[PDB]
């Protein structure tokens, strides 16, 4: 599923995401822009062989079990492949373990390089939450 713009805002709200540690909503919509470009379908090989899931793209080197990382971990108890559903409870809940992790929304390549320290509320402009 490719979401819409506000249409993902408000699912991330609903599941608690706003303010989470402190990141704001727009901080999460812009991640997932830049990660997935809203598609729950995204995935990408890392040159360690690990893969990254999800509209969050959650590393299987740590956080799932996509059968193929060996001497991987699986810290959010999870298949890969329940991080692809249309359904976002699940990269939600992995998320909250990560940004909890010690680096905050670091853990994000792409939100560091791209999102933080951004005009980040510009993401969820017009959008009826």
Not at 81 to 91: E, F, G, H, V, W
Not at 107 to 117: E, L, P, S
């Amino acid at each position: 599923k490719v979401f819409g713009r506000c249409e993902l805002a408000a699912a991330m709200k609903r599941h608690g995401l706003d303010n989470y540690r402190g990141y704001s909503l727009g901080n999460w919509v812009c991640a997932a822009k830049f990660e997935s470009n809203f598609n729950t379908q995204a995935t990408n090989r890392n040159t360690d062989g690990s893969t990254d899931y999800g509209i969050l793209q959650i590393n299987s080197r740590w956080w799932c079990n996509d059968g193929r990382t060996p001497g991987s971990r699986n810290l959010c108890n999870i298949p890969c492949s329940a991080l692809l559903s249309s359904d976002i409870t699940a990269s939600v809940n992995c998320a909250k373990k990560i940004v909890s992790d010690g680096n905050g929304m670091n853990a994000w390549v792409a939100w560091r390089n791209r999102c933080k320290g951004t005009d980040v509320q510009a993401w969820i402009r017009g959008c009826r939450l």
